[PDB]
């Protein structure tokens, strides 16, 4: 394999294991998507593209004593295909710090790696929620066949629950029963909590009664928007390629340079399972 040429770096196995931990544990905290979008794979380092079906059509289910029908198939409305981009960010580790570790035992400050891990995961969320124009990707706020609901004035105490009930209505019309999850921009999340009124309860918990998969803010979603997602590998997956990892790129100047790379793409297999409120 060895594109991940960790043999040529100076960092010993302990320093690698601590870099990998400082990346992974920063991913786990930073990502919102992998809380509501299930991982597919990881597939392998070399996979450049995925063929995947779109199951955008509703169809009946077979029910009989014996099984005398063949019309009760599921058939792809189309076999789409998607290329897996690279998300990457780079951090230096100064050669003096490696020398200090290897002689004195003052250990490498891997927080540079953790900051790269954050700046990659932020981009991963941005790709997943907002899509990306220039790669020709689509995301939950761009995929064209999705459901949509016109957002009401969420400064009124009746608004957000009603709009959630509209969204779950439109998902139920598609035949996507629960469990639903929802992700909300901070501009609206700071309203669901803010218009409790004299009725004296947070709308966030009122909605969390219905949207049993939970609600999240994400600063990545610009402006007033929300998206309701019927969760599961039946509807979406996040296809990883090669999971979030740090690569060595040789030195530049005397310093060492490393790259965090991540090759993930969003498989929206069922746009009818997505309902944006916007």
Query: Nearer to a second copy by C-beta: 97 or 278?
Result: 97
For 119, the token pair is 């700046």
CB 271 → a second copy: shortest distance, Å?
13
* 114 is an interface residue for a second copy by CB under 8 A: yes
- Candidate list 7, 13, 67, 150; residue touching a second copy; CB under 8 A: 67
Question: CA angle, corner 213, sides to 173 and 243, nearest 5?
Answer: 110
Contacts of 230 (CB under 8 A, 6+ apart): 171, 176, 177, 178, 179, 180, 273, 274
- What Cα–Cα distance (Å) separates residue 68 from each residue in 61, 65, 72, 137, 244? 13, 8, 10, 42, 48
Per-residue mark of binding to a second copy, 252-271 (x: CB under 8 A): xxxx-x-x-x-------xx-
Residues 167-226 that bind a second copy (CB under 8 A): 168-169, 172-175, 177-179, 186-187, 189-190, 193-202, 204-206, 209-210, 217-220
CB 117 → a second copy: shortest distance, Å?
7
* 143 is an interface residue for a second copy by CB under 8 A: no
Q: Minimal CA–CA distance to 174: which of 72, 71, 53, 55?
A: 55
* 79 is an interface residue for a second copy by CB under 8 A: yes
* 24 is an interface residue for a second copy by CB under 8 A: no
b/e per residue 38-66 (b: at least 16 CB within 10 A): eebbbeeeebeebebebbbeeeeeeeeee
* 115 is an interface residue for a second copy by CB under 8 A: yes
For 240, the token pair is 């990883």
CB 104 → a second copy: shortest distance, Å?
5
Do the Cβ atoms of 29 and 125 come closer than 8 Å? no
CB 258 → a second copy: shortest distance, Å?
10
Torsion sign over Cα 150, 154, 155, 159: positive
* 16 is an interface residue for a second copy by CB under 8 A: no
What is d(CA 49, CA 261) in angstroms, rounded to the nearest whole number? 17
CB 219 → a second copy: shortest distance, Å?
4
CB 210 → a second copy: shortest distance, Å?
6
Per-residue mark of binding to a second copy, 29-58 (x: CB under 8 A): xx-x-------xx-xxxxxxxxxxx-x---
- Candidate list 149, 166, 266, 275; residue touching a second copy; CB under 8 A: 166
* 3 is an interface residue for a second copy by CB under 8 A: yes
């Amino acid at each position: 394999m060895d594109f991940l040429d960790r043999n040529a770096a100076p960092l010993n196995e302990g320093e690698w294991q601590r870099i990998d931990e400082a990346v992974v544990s920063t991913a786990r905290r930073t990502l919102v998507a992998r809380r509501i979008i299930d991982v597919l794979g990881p597939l392998g380092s070399g996979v450049y593209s995925i063929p995947y079906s779109v199951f955008s059509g509703k169809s009946p289910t077979g029910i009989d004593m014996v099984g005398e029908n063949e019309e009760f198939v599921v058939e792809a409305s189309r076999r789409a295909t998607i290329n897996l981009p690279i998300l990457y960010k780079d951090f230096k580790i100064m050669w003096r710090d490696v020398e200090a570790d290897r002689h004195l035992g003052l250990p490498i400050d891997v927080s540079t790696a953790a900051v790269a891990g954050n700046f990659v995961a932020v981009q991963e969320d941005h790709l997943i929620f907002n899509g990306n124009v220039e790669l020709g990707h689509d995301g939950l706020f761009t995929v064209k066949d999705r459901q949509t609901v016109a957002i009401s004035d969420w400064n009124e105490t009746g608004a957000a629950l009603a709009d959630v009930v509209k969204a779950v209505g439109a998902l139920s019309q598609a035949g996507h029963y629960g469990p639903y999850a929802m992700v909300v921009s901070p501009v609206l999340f700071g309203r669901m909590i803010r218009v409790f009124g004299n009725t004296g309860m947070l709308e966030l918990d009122q909605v969390k009664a219905l949207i049993t998969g939970g609600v999240h803010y994400s600063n990545v979603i610009g402006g007033s928007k929300a998206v309701v997602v019927a969760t599961g590998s039946q509807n979406l997956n996040l296809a990883l390629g090669q999971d979030m990892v740090t690569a060595y790129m040789g030195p530049t100047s005397m310093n060492h340079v490393f790259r965090v790379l991540e090759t993930a793409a969003l498989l929206v297999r069922r746009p009818d399972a997505i309902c944006t409120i916007e």
